[PDB]
Design a protein around this ligand. Structure first.
Ligand SMILES: [Cl-]
Lengths: 17, 321
């Protein structure tokens, strides 16, 4: 069993600090 | 209905970050239902619906939402937004098994990131793209090796970039997946080197899951390196963390792996001990698959030392399953 690292996703927000 | 939309989306964002995507989704879907005249807000909403459903393992819906986001990002001429949606669509397509299109999309994320001189985005795109090529070679022969080698090059490129960026967690991700790609290609020494780096970084972050993974992966490589005692020792470590993490499924997994290793080391007493522990954990989890393989494993070990009847007991036991 190969243990993989997870994907990344790009995130957006409705607010920008 | 723009403020109400803004407000509803805020709840969804909070809940998804809160770790519960189910409720957040409903609040995002509510926000959509209310609507807004601001297309960049809708975009953000679509994007988050897509990530939540992706993490909720509904890939069909993740695909639709990211696709809407991508289209809207172009409509409004938001380049960073287009790159992001494109990467998200890419990753989703990979899970669904359209590799050709996943490549195109992740490449888009990469190409736009470069135009924007966005180094963080660029590196992330390289990793996602590496993942696609890796999955492509794994799912399947010259094309197979070619895809796996493409993944290696892409991980190497990511690592180079995230080293400059000082991003340790990105290094951790790329090292692990690089290691597993070397493993598939049959370069075991190189796999070991990569997973060793993955382990250092997991220990650095205090991440026990990642640490367990590295140990497992190292154990596997040493099996094919023909060094059995060393593999058993890394499995010993995974057993500890599995108990530590309170993960029984993994604990059982550790036991099984140790069982087979001691079988290769030709010590069948320890083999039986761990196969017994696997058998126990398997039933506990109501795993019929492992149960039979455990019965089979035990039958062999007892046969190895010529234990007679007890071998036959697990034989029948396995026969039933
Ligand atoms: Cl497309």
């Amino acid at each position: 069993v190969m243990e993989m690292e997870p994907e990344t996703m790009e995130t957006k927000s409705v607010i920008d600090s | 209905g723009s403020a109400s939309c803004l407000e509803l989306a805020l709840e969804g964002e909070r809940l998804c970050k809160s770790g519960d995507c189910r409720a957040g989704v409903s609040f995002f879907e509510a926000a959509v239902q209310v609507g807004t005249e601001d297309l960049k807000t809708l975009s953000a909403i679509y994007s988050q619906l897509g990530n939540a459903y992706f993490y909720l393992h509904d890939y069909a819906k993740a695909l639709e939402y990211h696709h809407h986001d991508l289209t809207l990002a172009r409509t409004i001429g938001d380049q960073l937004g287009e790159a992001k949606a494109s990467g998200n669509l890419g990753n989703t397509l990979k899970v669904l098994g359209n590799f050709d299109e996943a490549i195109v999309c992740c490449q888009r994320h990469l190409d736009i990131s470069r135009e924007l001189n966005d180094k963080v985005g660029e590196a992330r795109a390289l990793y996602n793209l590496g993942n696609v090529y890796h999955a492509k070679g794994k799912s399947f022969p010259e094309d197979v090796r070619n895809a796996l080698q493409a993944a290696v090059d892409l991980y190497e490129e990511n690592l180079s970039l995230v080293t400059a960026l000082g991003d340790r967690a990105a290094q951790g991700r790329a090292f692990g997946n690089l290691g597993n790609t070397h493993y598939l290609l049959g370069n075991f020494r190189d796999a070991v080197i990569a997973h060793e780096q993955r382990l250092l970084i997991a220990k650095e972050f205090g991440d026990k899951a990642a640490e367990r993974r590295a140990y497992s992966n190292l154990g596997n490589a040493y099996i094919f390196l023909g060094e059995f005692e060393t593999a058993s020792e890394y499995y010993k470590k995974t057993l500890l963390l599995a108990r530590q993490l309170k993960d029984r499924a993994v604990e059982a997994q550790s036991c099984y792996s140790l069982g087979n290793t001691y079988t290769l080391l030709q010590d069948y007493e320890k083999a039986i001990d761990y196969h017994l522990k696997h058998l126990a954990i398997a039933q506990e989890l109501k795993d019929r698959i492992g149960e039979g393989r455990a019965c089979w494993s035990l039958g062999n070990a007892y046969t190895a030392l010529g234990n007679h009847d007890q071998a036959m007991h697990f034989a029948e036991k396995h026969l039933e399953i």
